[PDB]
Amino acid sequence: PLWFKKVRQNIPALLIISLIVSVGMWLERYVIIVISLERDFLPSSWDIYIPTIWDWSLYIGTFGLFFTLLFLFIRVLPMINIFEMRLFLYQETEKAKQR
Amino acid sequence: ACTYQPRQYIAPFDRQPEGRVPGIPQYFASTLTLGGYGTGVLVRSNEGRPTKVEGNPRHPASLGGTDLFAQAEILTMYDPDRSTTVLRQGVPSTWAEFTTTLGNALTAARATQGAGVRLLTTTITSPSLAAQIEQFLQAYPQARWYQYEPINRDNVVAGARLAFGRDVTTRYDLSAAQVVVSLDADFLAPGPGFVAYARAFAERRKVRKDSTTMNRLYVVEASPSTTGTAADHRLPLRADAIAAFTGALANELGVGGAPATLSPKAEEFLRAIARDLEEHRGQSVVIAGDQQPPIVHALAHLINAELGNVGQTVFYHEPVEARPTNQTEELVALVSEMAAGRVETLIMIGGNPVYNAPGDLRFADRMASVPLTIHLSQFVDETSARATWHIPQAHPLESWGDARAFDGTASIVQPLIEPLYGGKTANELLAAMLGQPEAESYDLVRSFWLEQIGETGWQVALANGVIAETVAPVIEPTLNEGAIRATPIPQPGDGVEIVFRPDPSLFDGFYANNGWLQELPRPLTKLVWDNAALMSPRTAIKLLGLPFNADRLIGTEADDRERQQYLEQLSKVNGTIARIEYRGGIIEIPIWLLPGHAEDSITLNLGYGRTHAGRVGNNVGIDVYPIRTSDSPWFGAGARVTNTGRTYLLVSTQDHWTLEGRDIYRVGEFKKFKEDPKYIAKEVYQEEYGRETPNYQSLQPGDDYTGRNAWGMTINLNACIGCNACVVACQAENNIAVVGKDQVSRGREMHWIRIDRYFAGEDLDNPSIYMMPVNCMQCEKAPCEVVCPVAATVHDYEGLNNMVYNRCVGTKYCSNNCPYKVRRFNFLQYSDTTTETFKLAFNPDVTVRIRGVMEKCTYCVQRISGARIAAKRAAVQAGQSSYVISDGAIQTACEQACPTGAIVFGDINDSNSRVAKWKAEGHNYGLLGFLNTVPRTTYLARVRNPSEELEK
Amino acid sequence: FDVAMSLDPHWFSTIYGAHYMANAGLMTLAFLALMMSRVRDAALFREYVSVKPIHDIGKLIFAFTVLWTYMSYGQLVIIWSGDVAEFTPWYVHRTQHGWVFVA
């Protein structure tokens, strides 16, 4: 759906697609690693991988540390580069001057 | 916090031992008994402590080889749950109090003639104990011996009495047997003369370029076993129809028997057996299993005599079991005397009667009738808890004694340490009942063995492992045709049968506390820490009402992969609990699928469900002894399966029973192997590449290994039987930890060597079983070394793969790149630290791994380093600077344990070594050669010798 | 895949083809730079083309050169370190009988 323009200009559709893409990327890393490692050359060395609760707890924990650092960044430092934005404004003014 | 390391004190002796050099291990010759029969073992004492057990090359029945129980006796001695004190009634007591009570009780018996006094031992073969028991019987005429053990040979002596009219001992010399037929005889399993039979059979199966003959094995069994694996033809007949099968076999050869209505497959099998027999007269042998009824033994003796095998492959000796008797009948007589209240004192010497006796005898209830019960158990067993005056028994590795092997040899049980917790032996008790208390076990066996072989004979006997004077004489009994001909010969029927078989790793349940044996994956089943009802897939489908066709497993080569996928889907029914009703008993044991099993037959493994065992195995498995009956102790009549749902978690070390059309296991025929030993390798490569040679090309140079030693190993598939002796030897030698059942369920078992069965062929309900040992292949271009970032896994000058524990950070990448998956990781803290006895069992030449490191097979590097150092020291002390290692100087633990000799280790570069000659054969190949790993551990393809009448 | 890789049906590479696109991109960029130097005075470039497009195309040539080297080294190290025999004959022939000097 990203091929079209109306979908590309819709905000809720972009949020849903981004969430689905992130889930698919985690699934792709899982398919590459776990599935390939489960069944190797010797059939006798075959087993199944079932994740526990602690590696999940580490995952949510890493999300929290990531968001803690982001919230501290947006609270202390400016989240948009200021001098680059005013330079962009000056460049657009010069472009409008040259038509 | 500081100083890098603590103080580390050192405590030497106060008086040095005379013949010990500190830091040099020594070897002593002792004997280990399985079912009363001895086995000579060479046991290693590091600093006065037993640590390793190996074979005694000078002893028959152990020609440099051991069984799994002889290897695990090390940890059995170091169990922290062994009895430490005398218990009068669970109360800690003393030995002098028990002696005074025994003398006072025997004084009352002296008023009678010992009518109330009763004994209860196991299969006794020790001449000293037998002589002291006979002397005690002469002192007390009305006393009775009564020996019994759950795994006995009552059918063998009954068949010998029926045929010859006397007690005889039957020995088989398989080295001159071109055709061997087994009638439910698991002679390739741990039993009487197992190591000698397996060695002779293997040396007859080891084929080479110059080889010209090869023996053939016929087996007829209900549940598949190790013997059925090495069989060229296997017939899954029911357990009851084997007596009628033997009668039909005797009838076809022209000898007195009885025809039986059998299946067309069994008819064609009788045809081929009879045709290969009669053409190999004096070069054949028919073996009857101890489980089979006495008539089967007698018919086998008759068949062997008529064929002329007697004196060539079947030999008869005088009995070597002291008193040969029907043990179950004597147990019934003893429980009858107990129920009548006639017995007043019951002395038991091991055997655990409360747990081992059949359920219909009610031993525990009748045990209350006798007031005084006394037991020596080496543990606080179930019987000792319900008895008075429990006496701790000394372990065979800490006691003086003797024993007799099959064919009779009378070896000496030499101790290696004073008894840790005290504890007396059997002859010490027998001397106590003979009015001779505080008698030393040394002086007792030394007094009996003197005045018979002499002092110089006792010194020579202790030096070696055998006594040269004692051997069962060769006798020639006469055969009674009329008695063996006039026999009912029972027929099968009554429906679903139950087959009681000893557990491959636990035997009668004595070793249920041993962690090494409880964790050892069982052969053909790969289960650990549990017990299951083994049945064929068709039997489970028909009886438990499972939604599978069971006919889709039948097919040709065109749909083999689809059948293997269906077998994978069918294996999902493992764990369903079944309420087996046999004779008034419900067992409710989970089921397991064993393809080779005969239909309408369920195999239940003994030795589980103990309640007074140690911390290991205290509540594992479901007890099958209650449903076991005295009338038939090995076979069953009719049963009700009653599926209950309510699944139970069964744990397996493989979880995949089929090789998915790959070049893992190679099989050929002997007729084609004779013309060209390289024909198996020329195949596959044609179907994979179109040419007869795979022109593998590599981009890595590797190393040279020309003028230096190159350590290599060869595994002969024609000799491997899956006895799992190499696994217990590797565990005992390399300090391998023992993880729980929970850690095995998550696939975290720690084992440097593993045996894989692959259940392949058509039908998949009558499949050929392929056992293959796998350890570290020691790849010259090892892919596990080019991935570890801390260089903890590198390569050696001699081509060995060095795995250094103190450098591993634990990235677990060294395992993902290993094509064979032979590397085990300490995900948690697995090695024991608190138990002192387990710390005493560790081998001091191998580091004990901590949490977070990797392990794998190291070719027993401690033995390679010792031989290299000894070779360098001998070279410099003579002034040669040669440094040359002999061929047989190094022997890995898995090489010494193997009773068949399937594992051969040695120098690759030395052309005259046994490995260099074996690797030069046409059928020598290495696993997963498409990956340019260049393994140093190779395999010799399996060659079969099938009959033309069955194949065509 | 069809024209060039099918010459040896025993060998295949997934990165191959993308290596061909980066190779064709570097060739057409150098070809464009040559033809731009040829027609630099066509009375159309002189009035509408400055040094900025020439600098950008030079930067693109530099980026595609290191891109091609990155793809080729990636394929080489993947096949080299993982010494699988189904992918080694390719780099064997290219390192044999003097072909190494070309590399």
Ligand code: SF4
């Ligand atoms: S290789 Fe191991 S499993 Fe096979 S026969 Fe020898 S000791 Fe037994």
Ligand code: SF4
């Ligand atoms: S078998 Fe595995 S651990 Fe052993 S050398 Fe080869 S890759 Fe390494």
Ligand code: SF4
């Ligand atoms: S060679 Fe040694 S370490 Fe390797 S499997 Fe055999 S006993 Fe274990």
Ligand code: F3S
């Ligand atoms: S990757 Fe190396 S760090 Fe250890 S886990 Fe393997 S030897």
